[PDB]
Amino acid sequence: CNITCSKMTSKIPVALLIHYQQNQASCGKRAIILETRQHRLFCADPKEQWVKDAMQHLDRQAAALT
Amino acid sequence: GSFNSIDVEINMYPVNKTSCNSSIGSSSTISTSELTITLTHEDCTPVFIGDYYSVVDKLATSGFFTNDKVHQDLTTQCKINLEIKCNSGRESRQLTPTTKVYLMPHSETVTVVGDCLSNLDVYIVYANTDAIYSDMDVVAYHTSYILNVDHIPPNDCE
């Protein structure tokens, strides 16, 4: 597990985010992993609208890239 | 030699205030009650769309970013002015970066007011996201030891 979800991250500007990933059940908290432009990873909580919109945004970017 | 994206990363130590107020405009600022960071730029084609500020203990990272939707006009020269002001300050010296050669055109100035930081790193990143390999000019300033801020997330102001 390259990362184990302790604290969750508060709002990060959607423009700074480049990828998200479902975190392994095995890893830590069953939450979302966020990747930033700075090549960094943080654990977010999927219930918050902000994270939800973030996800629909990156989803939107990944399509288009295709 | 073109670029389409600019990032400014400011890391600081030690800081005590966490609530923060920010603004992107002709004059762009990140403010707490203890610190003010101000960004002006000129002839910069990429557009700044936000800033951030997050602290863990008395360790903080913060900065400003454009998207990458537009390249720098190569007929003008992008100019970045960054001031870092202590609300308890007087002396206003500027800063000297690590020496180095750059593949893109730009000028930058970092001014510091006050003495309230033992540690200060300032990175200006001009990036060409149309490159296959990593294509970034990185102008770096340090006032002491280089802080590690991996693990501090770039949260917006609040």
Residue numbers in the entry:
A (entry chain B): 8 to 73
B (entry chain A): 161 to 318
Paper text:
To directly elucidate the chemokine binding by the SECRET domain, we reconstituted a complex of the SECRET domain with the chemokine domain of CX3CL1 and determined its structure at a resolution of 2.6 Å. In the complex, one SECRET domain monomer binds one CX3CL1 monomer, displaying a 1∶1 stoichiometry. The SECRET domain contacts the CX3CL1 with its β-sheet I, burying a surface of ∼530 Å2. The SECRET domain contacting residues are from the strands 1, 5, and 6 of β-sheet I and the C-terminal extended loop, while the CX3CL1 contacting residues are from the N-loop, 310 helix, 40s loop, and the β3 strand. The binding interface can be described as a small hydrophobic core surrounded by a large halo of hydrophilic interactions. The hydrophobic core is composed of residues Y212 and F225 from CrmD, and I19, L23 and F49 from CX3CL1. The acidic residues D167, E169, and D316 from the SECRET domain form salt-bridge interactions with R44, R47, and K18 from CX3CL1, respectively. Mutating charged residues K18, R44, and R47 in CX3CL1 induced more significant binding affinity decrease than mutating hydrophobic residues I19, L23, and F49, suggesting the importance of the salt-bridge interactions in the complex formation of the SECRET domain with CX3CL1. The SECRET domain utilizes its β-sheet I to interact with CX3CL1, whereas vCCI utilizes its β-sheet II to interact with CCL4 upon complex formation. It suggests that although the SECRET domain does not directly block the most important receptor binding site on CX3CL1 (i.e. the N-termini and critical hydrophobic residues of the N-loop), its binding is still close to the receptor binding site and bring steric hindrance to prevent efficient interaction with the receptor, which would provide a structural basis for the ability of the SECRET domain to inhibit CX3CL1 and CCL25 induced cell migration.
